[PDB]
Enzyme design. Structure first.
Site, PDB file in Angstrom:
ATOM      1  N   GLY A 365       0.806  -1.225   0.000  1.00 47.21           N
ATOM      2  CA  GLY A 365       0.000   0.000   0.000  1.00 47.21           C
ATOM      3  C   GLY A 365       0.844   1.282   0.000  1.00 47.21           C
ATOM      4  O   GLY A 365       2.074   1.204   0.069  1.00 47.21           O
ATOM      5  N   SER A 367       2.708   4.660   1.458  1.00 42.95           N
ATOM      6  CA  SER A 367       3.467   4.931   2.690  1.00 42.95           C
ATOM      7  C   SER A 367       2.647   5.728   3.713  1.00 42.95           C
ATOM      8  O   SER A 367       1.891   6.628   3.351  1.00 42.95           O
ATOM      9  CB  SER A 367       4.768   5.670   2.361  1.00 42.95           C
ATOM     10  OG  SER A 367       5.542   5.833   3.531  1.00 42.95           O
ATOM     11  N   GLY A 369      -0.024   4.831   5.024  1.00 44.09           N
ATOM     12  CA  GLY A 369      -1.435   4.467   4.857  1.00 44.09           C
ATOM     13  C   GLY A 369      -1.930   3.341   5.770  1.00 44.09           C
ATOM     14  O   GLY A 369      -3.135   3.107   5.825  1.00 44.09           O
ATOM     15  N   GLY A 370      -1.028   2.651   6.478  1.00 42.03           N
ATOM     16  CA  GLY A 370      -1.360   1.650   7.503  1.00 42.03           C
ATOM     17  C   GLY A 370      -0.501   0.382   7.510  1.00 42.03           C
ATOM     18  O   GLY A 370      -0.522  -0.334   8.508  1.00 42.03           O
ATOM     19  N   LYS A 371       0.290   0.103   6.462  1.00 43.39           N
ATOM     20  CA  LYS A 371       1.031  -1.167   6.291  1.00 43.39           C
ATOM     21  C   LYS A 371       1.853  -1.572   7.515  1.00 43.39           C
ATOM     22  O   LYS A 371       1.749  -2.706   7.975  1.00 43.39           O
ATOM     23  CB  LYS A 371       1.897  -1.157   5.009  1.00 43.39           C
ATOM     24  CG  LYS A 371       3.049  -0.132   4.990  1.00 43.39           C
ATOM     25  CD  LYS A 371       4.026  -0.304   3.824  1.00 43.39           C
ATOM     26  CE  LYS A 371       3.386   0.092   2.497  1.00 43.39           C
ATOM     27  NZ  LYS A 371       4.393   0.198   1.411  1.00 43.39           N
ATOM     28  N   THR A 372       2.619  -0.644   8.087  1.00 39.59           N
ATOM     29  CA  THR A 372       3.551  -0.937   9.184  1.00 39.59           C
ATOM     30  C   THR A 372       2.810  -1.344  10.452  1.00 39.59           C
ATOM     31  O   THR A 372       3.246  -2.230  11.164  1.00 39.59           O
ATOM     32  CB  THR A 372       4.448   0.272   9.457  1.00 39.59           C
ATOM     33  OG1 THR A 372       5.027   0.698   8.248  1.00 39.59           O
ATOM     34  CG2 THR A 372       5.571  -0.012  10.442  1.00 39.59           C
ATOM     35  N   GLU A 495      10.979  -5.694   4.109  1.00 38.70           N
ATOM     36  CA  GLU A 495      11.710  -5.097   2.981  1.00 38.70           C
ATOM     37  C   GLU A 495      12.354  -3.743   3.366  1.00 38.70           C
ATOM     38  O   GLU A 495      12.053  -3.160   4.407  1.00 38.70           O
ATOM     39  CB  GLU A 495      10.802  -4.998   1.740  1.00 38.70           C
ATOM     40  CG  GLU A 495      10.239  -6.350   1.249  1.00 38.70           C
ATOM     41  CD  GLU A 495      11.173  -7.086   0.283  1.00 38.70           C
ATOM     42  OE1 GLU A 495      11.043  -6.859  -0.944  1.00 38.70           O
ATOM     43  OE2 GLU A 495      12.006  -7.897   0.743  1.00 38.70           O
TER      44      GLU A 495
END
Lengths: 568, 568
Positions: A365, A367, A369-372, A495
């Site tokens: 998604g 940066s 936006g919620g991924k982490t 990553e």
């Protein structure tokens, strides 16, 4: 009130107070022996009026100097030793706290500042315990004991000292603080000029290309002129301050020493009482500095204790509570879960997904936006604000973090190279009595062995900020070897956040391909192109979701944010 | 020998030596008045044996204290003022040197260190001139003048001081240097531990993921144990050093003051001579510190003078010599030219090309392969080692660098934002009496005006490390406006070395397209794709060449290094 936390912080080190008590006592007894030396000297100087030296008087003055030095030395040792044993205890406690804090602690609080806690704040308390408390106590006894003997021995000359010493300080202290203000003002103007030259010299090519050499010179010439107009104010002020300090200090000295001398010739005093008076003036005027030092230091030190007892107050990460895991080869699920650092300001809202056993599920998604957050919840780095992450039947908070972190395996491509031996980095924290026959085989499978044998020794090398330094695919293969030797059920692959391009691809991609077999693999992507062949791919945006397919299946069936397949 | 450059460095400031001479003289006369105060005090104390105070004696002691303070104050001012006027002159000379050095100076020599020259080294010489020379001279007179009066007044008590003072220093100085070594050893072990904690705390996620919390604690616990085993050595040493300093210093004081007291009671001395002796002990033992300070400082200061006279020795860039330019709309040529920082180690060898009038000629190739040297030679930032750059007929060293740098225009995409007003940055170094009607029109053509009117004021803003900070296409448009307002014949365009992607392309590409019309344009490329439509393109590799065509013409006709059209 204010000193309550300081003794509570010291007590938990088990400080053996009897030994500190005695050390303090000896410090006092030593100070009362300092007051006796000038009375023995008075008796010597007055007795020599019949001018044959009584050798026992000068022997008794020497014996008291050696007893003084012995009790001073034992006391100084004892204070230092006991203080060194307290500081080590505080260090120990802060360390084992630090080391077990929830890792989220480290997001809010700067690592390097935390280290300062351990190192500096502990030092500050050491100085108080070792030096300043004793210094105070001894100083008080020295000053009051000197003045009470002086007042008994000659009152008029004592009243002159009690007028001259504060009347001198009443003039010198305002003058000292005014002079210091002009020193600080001159340092700030010197920093401002230094900053003007430091911006013109890296621009020098543009200065020369523009023909601007004359105008830059004129602007530097303005900056040396303001330093000059300030420096001639410092010269005016210091020309009054310098001779006024010398005038007041000797006029005080000429009045005190000179009025004492006038009493000896007048017959109001003896030569030995003037010698005693001059010896006590050092024992007044010198320990007044250690008195003021105490107050100076206590202001900063008391803050330091609140600053540490802070730390010791923190919640530890409870790794041991709950069940141990078996058969983690089960579908993970997120069940209408949420997260945020506040009850209101959610970073992730009511999200639902399954992460199948023996399957790959990539996270992607825009940066921020919620991924982490979705990844750190599965890594149990954070605990969810509502709903549950689950592992087959049970919510994952059923299981010990010590047991969960034995079944997951973490590998970051922007890999941290922690300091140590190249073997120990492959079994880090793996308490199983491992043998080199196994460590070698894990390094084989990771395609590290052939590189390890190229290093200065067949299977040793020190690495980190010391020894050999390694880049990209060299550090990544020993990380994949560590992952491989631990036997994870779930793999959690991070990553590169700094968005580096991958290096020596054929080896590390082959090493991952052997690590990943049969493993439930969760991977978080900083470019979409690295994960496209996954069994499942999850697209996270503004703390909500739309992706729940494989890449081409989702790109065909949904496509509501095709743009991220173009930005990649 | 060694002091020869210091007076040569001072002389060129025009220091008005008569005023420094007088200031030094007054410093001496003041010191000879310090020696008289204890002799007036002797006369007072001895005279009070008939115990009615002669009020004129205590008035004469006060009058001499006020004359002492007046001559001290005028002397201190005079030294400071004259010193401040020397430092400003040195500053001035270093500055105008710095500002006109060949820009190549700045490749070899660190900018921030150069600034230190100006700022710090000048300060060091100030301290010597203002403070230390006078301090020395006065100190010597004070110590020798005190001891020669003491030896006349009572020789036996002087010989005791000449034995006790060096016998005390012979014991205290070895002890001071040993104690200081253990202090430094403890600071280095404290830095080593601080570095061990600073590497474990940023790794804390891996520490927790590994179950390594116990092993990291054990290794931190080893680091506090070495600090403890060192701190208990400092405690052992300091327990002998502390009481030995107190023993030697008072035993010396009890011997000197106490033997003087024994002579007064014996009849070998008067009470006033003991008062004079005690007053001279301050005038010996206090200025011994300023004596040693001189030697301490001179060691560093003499180096500082060599460190500056260095600078003033450098070659200036001769901008004025040679012809002025007319009609620069002529083909540039490089005629079998070479360059390198050594006669042997060439960065560019025997290169030949023409750069046609009213034409675009782009420079391209692999990094470090020679591109920057070919560009800096045309920008006349460097001078060639053999052969000539030419402009039509003449070799370019025929023309004044001040005139060449009026006909070229430099624009770098990684643009430096020098500190100042948004208008002054558009006419920087352009000494032509320019009016806002022209500055506005240049900002129009540069497509800056519409953005400038968006700032806090209609046509003012301060920019740099202060005021408004600007990014990419905002700073680049005021640079293109500066270029446009100067009316260059040749444009020299420097692409981003840090390899940033271009921003707000349609505006800056349109601004360049209006700047470039009718101009002989030389551009250096960090990616090949930005210059492909040029009339001519030059490919530079290993200090030699192969490109001499337009992009598709060369890619068809030559192709010997097609790889750079793939790497781009």
């Amino acid at each position: 009130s204010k000193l309550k936390p300081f003794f509570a912080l010291v007590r938990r080190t088990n400080p053996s107070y009897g030994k500190l008590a005695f050390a303090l006592a000896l410090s006092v007894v030593t100070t009362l022996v300092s007051l006796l030396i000038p009375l023995l000297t008075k008796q010597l100087v007055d007795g020599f009026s019949m001018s044959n030296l009584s050798g026992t008087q000068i022997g008794l003055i020497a014996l008291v100097f050696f007893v003084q030095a012995g009790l001073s030395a034992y006391a100084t040792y004892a204070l230092n030793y006991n203080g060194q044993k307290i500081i080590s205890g505080l260090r120990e406690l802060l360390w084992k706290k630090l080391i077990k804090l929830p890792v989220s602690y480290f997001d809010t609080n700067a690592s390097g500042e935390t280290v300062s806690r351990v190192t500096n704040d502990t030092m500050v308390v050491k100085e108080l315990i070792t030096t300043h408390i004793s210094g105070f106590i001894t100083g008080i006894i020295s000053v009051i004991g000197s003045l009470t003997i002086l007042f008994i021995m000659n009152w008029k000359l004592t009243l002159l000292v009690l007028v001259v010493v504060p009347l001198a300080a009443l003039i010198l202290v305002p003058i000292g603080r005014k002079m210091f203000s002009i020193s600080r003002e001159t340092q700030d103007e010197t920093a401002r000029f230094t900053g003007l030259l430091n911006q013109i010299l890296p621009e020098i090519r543009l200065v020369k290309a523009s023909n601007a050499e004359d105008v830059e010179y004129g602007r530097g010439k303005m900056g040396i002129s303001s330093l000059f107009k300030l420096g001639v104010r410092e010269a005016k002020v210091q020309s009054l301050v310098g001779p006024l300090i010398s005038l007041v200090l000797m006029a005080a000295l000429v009045a005190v020493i000179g009025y004492g001398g006038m009493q000896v010739s007048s017959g109001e005093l003896t030569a030995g009482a003037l010698v005693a008076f001059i010896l006590y003036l050092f024992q007044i005027i010198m320990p007044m500095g250690q008195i003021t030092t105490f107050f100076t230091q206590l202001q900063k030190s008391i803050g330091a204790t609140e600053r540490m007892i802070e730390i010791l107050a923190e919640e530890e990460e409870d790794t041991v509570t709950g069940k141990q895991i078996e058969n983690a080869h089960l579908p993970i699920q997120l069940d209408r879960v949420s997260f945020g650092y506040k009850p209101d300001q959610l970073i992730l809202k009511e999200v639902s997904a399954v992460i199948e056993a023996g399957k790959v599920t990539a996270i992607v998604g825009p940066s921020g936006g919620g991924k982490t957050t979705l990844f750190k919840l599965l890594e149990r780095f954070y605990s969810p604000t509502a709903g549950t992450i689950r592992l087959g039947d049970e919510p994952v908070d059923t299981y010990s973090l010590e047991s969960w972190r034995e079944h997951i395996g973490y590998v970051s491509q922007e890999s941290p190279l922690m300091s140590g031996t190249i073997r120990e980095n492959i079994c880090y924290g793996l308490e199983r009595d491992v043998t080199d026959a196994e460590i070698e085989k894990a390094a084989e499978m990771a395609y590290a062995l052939n590189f390890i044998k190229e290093l200065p020794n067949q299977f040793d090398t020190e690495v980190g900020e010391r020894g050999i330094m390694l880049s990209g695919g060299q550090r990544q293969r020993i990380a994949i070897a560590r992952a491989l030797l631990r036997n994870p059920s779930i793999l959690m692959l991070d990553e590169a956040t700094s968005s580096l391009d991958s290096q020596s691809e054929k080896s590390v991609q082959q090493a991952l391909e052997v690590l990943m077999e049969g493993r439930t693999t969760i991977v978080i992507a900083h470019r979409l192109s690295t994960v496209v062949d996954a069994d499942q791919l999850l697209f996270v945006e503004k703390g909500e979701i739309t992706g729940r397919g494989t890449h081409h299946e989702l790109m065909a069936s949904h496509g509501l944010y095709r743009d991220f397949a173009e930005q990649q």
